[PDB]
């Protein structure tokens, strides 16, 4: 259990139940003590959030012909934030807010995290990513970090194998239930979470 202690954790439109900043800090410290490192944020929906934290991230019937298949996350919670919400309406017509997830991988996998300046969709991307990882796409036990799109923020794509080895826990950064669609407000990020959110330094040259 990597959730620190203090009562059952659940995800609500109301906010994440039982997850204070303090608890976060304990959880994070203990993940490091077993040799894990934080690699980015992952926003998504409440239902989803629940599955990832209790059951872990798992691919499921991906398009094998889809070469960029993987689990996208982001160093910047703001960019993650955007995906923290239902993607479609419920029968009534409500689009409720979601939750931000913090992604951790076994420290032992860092050898496979690479970075580039090309935008992942660009023609060169494919070849250059492959140059960096040592094999044709899709990514596997490796990850690539690069501009979401020209000038955009940076996203990270852990390959499905690696992603299945992650450990995710809740963030102390809340989504707004009364502003679904707004951009994450920099002041709602707790300072203490900011302290434990540095990213590892990724390699720009192949191994």
């Amino acid at each position: 259990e990597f959730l620190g202690d203090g009562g059952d954790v659940s995800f609500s439109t109301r906010g994440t139940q039982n997850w204070t900043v303090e608890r976060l800090l304990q959880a994070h410290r203990q993940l490091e003590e077993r040799g894990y490192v934080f690699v980015g944020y992952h926003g998504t929906f409440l239902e989803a959030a629940q599955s990832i934290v209790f059951g872990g991230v798992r691919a499921r019937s991906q398009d094998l012909d889809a070469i960029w298949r993987g689990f996208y996350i982001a160093g910047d919670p703001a960019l993650a934030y955007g995906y923290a919400q239902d993607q479609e309406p419920d029968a009534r017509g409500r689009i409720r807010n979601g939750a931000l997830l913090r992604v951790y991988v076994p420290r032992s996998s860092l050898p496979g995290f690479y970075r580039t300046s090309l935008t992942l969709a660009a023609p060169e991307a494919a070849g250059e990513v492959e140059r960096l990882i040592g094999h044709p796409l899709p990514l596997r036990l490796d990850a690539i970090t690069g501009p979401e799109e020209e000038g955009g923020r940076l996203e990270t794509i852990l390959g499905w194998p690696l992603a299945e080895r992650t450990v995710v826990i809740p963030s102390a950064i809340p989504t707004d239930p009364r502003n679904v669609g707004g951009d994450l407000d920099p002041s709602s990020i707790p300072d203490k979470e900011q302290a434990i959110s540095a990213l590892p330094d990724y390699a720009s040259q192949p191994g």
Partner: protein, 823 residues
């Protein structure tokens, strides 16, 4: 007894032999007990749909001799009594008047020791205001003997003072036209007894007994049984002085032939003097039946008194012989119940209780049935005859012969008899009876008038309101029973037309009612019946409304997450008139856009152009808010309409000031830019955008909040009217009018009371006006506070801040920038 539909129907044709009444009494004075006794005695039973017991049918027969003592046209020895149910506490003001308005007689129950208590005094006043003939009963006489061990003469003086108190009320508030309506024991309109033990009597009963042992026509036997009349045992003569020739005292007739027999049985039995009991009993011809013979103490007395003086019959005697039939009363009650010309074709038909004239059926209340969440109308046929299938004009509260507003020409699905808990189908029903109708539920909220005459006004309406102005959040204390709460809430809303249960975005379960008490009751019945599961109820709260005062400072704009779709809009105010029009069915969502447009353009000064472009109303698809499509040549526009509307429904249900409903908000969609491919213009994308734009627009259109306000009508003696204005001035109340009832010293003050200031109002008014005041308050209008909801220290901002905190939202109100595009 059991009757067939025919028997019942046949009985309902002889209106001259029907009695429509209620029982006015404080609950702690055997109200429920006495009533039962009548049911256990003359309760009518029919020879799978259950309802909420609203009226009980009673049958009683009398001798051709008794029928004669009836100073009012009759026919036959059979009688049908309709016992219409009443509330337990007086606070239920509005429904107290409801029951009264459909009755003609009344059985007022007063207590021996305590006499006429304030409460009963008040309801009696109201009854007198509707021209109800009272008939009194002094209950709990037992408590006088067993406890106080009072003497024959002291107990007499008691009743005397009591009967006197009552008549002080009866004469001061009854209408002169009605004539002397005071109660007189010697005239058989005052019974005495004990609901506990189950006994009660009338001078007229002992007078029919002692009737011949003295050679008297009971007329003069009962006349002697009360007041100053003495019978010297020695002289064996009747005198009118409490002393014989020498100066020795003489026992009054009442104490001699009434109170004495009863006083001995009590003294004998309760002292266990087994030698006397048998002797004493045989003299009164009281035959114990085997098993009862061994009884002793209370157990015994209780059985003796029942065989001796059957409480049920004493009451049933007064009801038939003194309470007016649905013929005598309507002649002098019609004018008061018809809000049209006192010479109108119908008003006349009311007076004459003519079953041939155009229908004039009064719906006093809607009662919950088992058959679905449907409700059956309960009322009385004042004129003509109602019959299954007959199509009728259902004239609601706002109807007026002139216009077509609030009218619903439909067909009466089924006519049924309100046999208490069960209903019994009946073809027709002539004027003068209390009947039930099936199939009006979706036309009449609670009260209303049913007619056939196209020129028929409504009958004295009873102001009721379905406006949720008070609500609370319900939670289960023990999470396990949660599903049991989800059921009762659904159950509760099904039992009452005016309660409301729903879920907020926050996922809370809300219960909203007509007022402090109305909700209060609803909550009890939830934690005790509908759910019977322990719950965590939040403190009461007044429902507000979020609105705008002007047009958006500048164009509001937002884009979807895609960053491919944009919505440009502006918000502007809607005129109270229009909003009311929308609230009052004039401007209708379901109308023909063209017809509706014609109306708004014409009667409300709207550009027929804009009105023809209405996309929807809100919330709940029919609220006083609109979205007008003012775009110009936006390809694919219609493909995002449903989303836009959907969003509007959420935007108007919970606004940006502090989660409250929007009211009188106009949203004009100025422009829209849509991705060429549908894939990217889905709901997930448009819905949030519009929602945010709307908020932005809203916040830019000079925000303000509205507070609801009640219209309280108060009945009160000129003497206590003081306390009224007293409390009104400490609640921000606004006096609208104060009048007096011609004859009596009964003022009737009407004022405006801010709902958010009405908490515990009745309680305080109680102390103030010595409890003589009788309130009647209903939702009246929405008032726009002047202060800035955005300024924390202002008055509205104070409301907003607290509310925001309560909901655990960010203490400050989002500026428009949060919803405008983050450019």
């Amino acid at each position: 007894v059991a009757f067939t539909v025919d028997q019942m129907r046949s009985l309902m044709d002889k209106v001259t032999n029907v009695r429509n009444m209620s029982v006015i009494a404080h609950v702690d004075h055997g109200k429920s007990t006495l009533t039962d006794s009548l049911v256990q005695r003359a309760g009518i039973i029919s020879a799978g749909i259950t309802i909420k017991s609203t009226a009980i049918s009673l049958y009683s027969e009398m001798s051709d001799e008794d029928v004669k003592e009836i100073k009012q046209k009759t026919d036959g020895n059979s009688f049908l009594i309709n016992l219409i149910d009443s509330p337990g506490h007086v606070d239920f003001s509005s429904e107290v008047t409801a029951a009264l308005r459909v009755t003609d007689g009344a059985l007022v129950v007063v207590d021996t020791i305590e006499g006429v208590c304030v409460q009963t005094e008040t309801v009696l006043r109201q009854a007198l205001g509707e021209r109800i003939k009272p008939v009194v009963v002094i209950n709990k006489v037992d408590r006088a003997l067993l406890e106080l061990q009072v003497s024959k003469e002291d107990l007499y003086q008691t009743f005397a003072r009591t009967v006197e108190s009552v008549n002080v009320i009866v004469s001061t508030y009854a209408d002169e036209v009605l004539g002397d309506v005071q109660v007189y024991p010697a005239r058989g309109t005052v019974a005495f007894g004990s609901g506990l033990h189950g006994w009660a009597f009338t001078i007229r009963q002992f007078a029919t007994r002692y009737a011949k042992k003295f050679g008297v026509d009971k007329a003069k036997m009962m006349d002697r049984l009360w007041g100053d009349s003495f019978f010297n045992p020695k002289t064996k003569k009747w005198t009118n002085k409490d002393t014989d020739a020498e100066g020795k005292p003489l026992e009054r007739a009442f104490n001699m032939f009434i109170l004495d027999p009863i006083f001995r049985l009590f003294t004998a039995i309760m002292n266990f003097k087994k030698d006397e009991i048998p002797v004493l009993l045989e003299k009164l011809e009281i035959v114990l039946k085997g098993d009862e013979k061994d009884l002793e103490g209370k157990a015994l007395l209780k059985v003796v008194m029942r065989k001796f003086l059957p409480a049920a019959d004493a009451l049933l005697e007064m009801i038939v012989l003194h309470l007016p039939s649905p013929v005598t009363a309507q002649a002098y009650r019609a004018e008061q119940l018809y809000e049209g010309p006192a010479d109108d074709a119908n008003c006349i038909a009311i007076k004459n209780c003519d079953p041939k004239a155009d229908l004039m059926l009064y719906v006093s209340k809607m009662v919950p049935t088992s058959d679905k969440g449907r409700f059956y109308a309960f009322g009385r046929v004042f004129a003509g005859t109602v019959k299954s299938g007959q199509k009728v004009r259902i004239q609601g509260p706002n109807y007026v012969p002139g216009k077509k507003d609030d009218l619903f020409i439909k067909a009466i699905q089924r006519v049924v008899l309100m046999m208490g808990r069960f209903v019994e189908p009946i073809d027709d029903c002539p004027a003068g009876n209390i009947i039930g109708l099936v199939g009006i539920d979706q036309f009449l909220l609670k009260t209303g008038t049913l007619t056939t005459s196209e020129t028929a006004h409504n009958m004295k309406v009873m102001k009721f309101s379905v406006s949720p102005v008070v609500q609370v959040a319900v939670e289960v204390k023990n999470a396990n029973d949660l599903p049991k709460l989800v059921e009762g809430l659904k159950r509760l809303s099904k039992s009452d037309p005016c309660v409301l249960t729903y879920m907020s975005e926050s996922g809370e379960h809300i219960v909203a009612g007509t007022g402090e008490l109305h909700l209060e009751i609803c909550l009890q019945d939830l934690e005790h019946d509908h759910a019977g599961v322990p719950l965590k109820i939040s403190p009461p709260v007044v429902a507000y409304r979020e609105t705008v005062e002007s047009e958006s400072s500048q164009t509001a704009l937002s884009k979807s997450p895609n960053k491919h779709n944009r919505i440009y809009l502006k918000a502007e105010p809607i005129d109270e008139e229009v909003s009311l029009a929308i609230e009052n069915g004039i401007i209708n969502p379901r109308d023909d856009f063209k017809a509706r447009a014609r109306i708004m353009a014409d009667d409300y000064g709207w550009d027929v152009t804009d009105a023809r472009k209405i996309w929807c109303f809100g919330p709940d698809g029919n609220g006083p808010n609109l979205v007008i499509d003012q775009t110009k040549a936006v390809q694919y526009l219609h493909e995002i309409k449903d989303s836009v509307v959907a969003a509007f429904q959420w935007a108007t249900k919970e606004g940006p000031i502090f989660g409250e409903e929007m009211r009188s908000v106009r949203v004009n969609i100025l422009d829209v830019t849509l991705h060429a491919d549908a894939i990217h213009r889905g709901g997930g994308q448009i819905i949030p955008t519009m929602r945010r734009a709307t908020y932005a627009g809203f916040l830019l259109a000079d925000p303000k909040i509205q507070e609801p306000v009640f219209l309280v009508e108060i009945q009160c003696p000129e003497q206590a009217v003081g306390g009224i204005y007293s409390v009104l001035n400490k609640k921000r109340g606004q006096v609208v009018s104060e009048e007096q009832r011609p004859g009596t010293p009964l003022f009737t003050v009407k004022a405006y009371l801010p709902v958010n200031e009405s908490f515990g109002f009745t309680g305080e008014l109680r102390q103030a006006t010595g409890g003589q005041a009788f309130p009647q308050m209903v939702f009246d209008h929405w008032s726009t506070l002047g202060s800035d909801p955005l300024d924390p220290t202002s008055k509205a901002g104070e409301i907003v801040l607290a509310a925001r905190k309560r909901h655990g939202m960010k203490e400050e109100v989002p500026g428009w920038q949060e919803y405008y595009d983050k450019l």
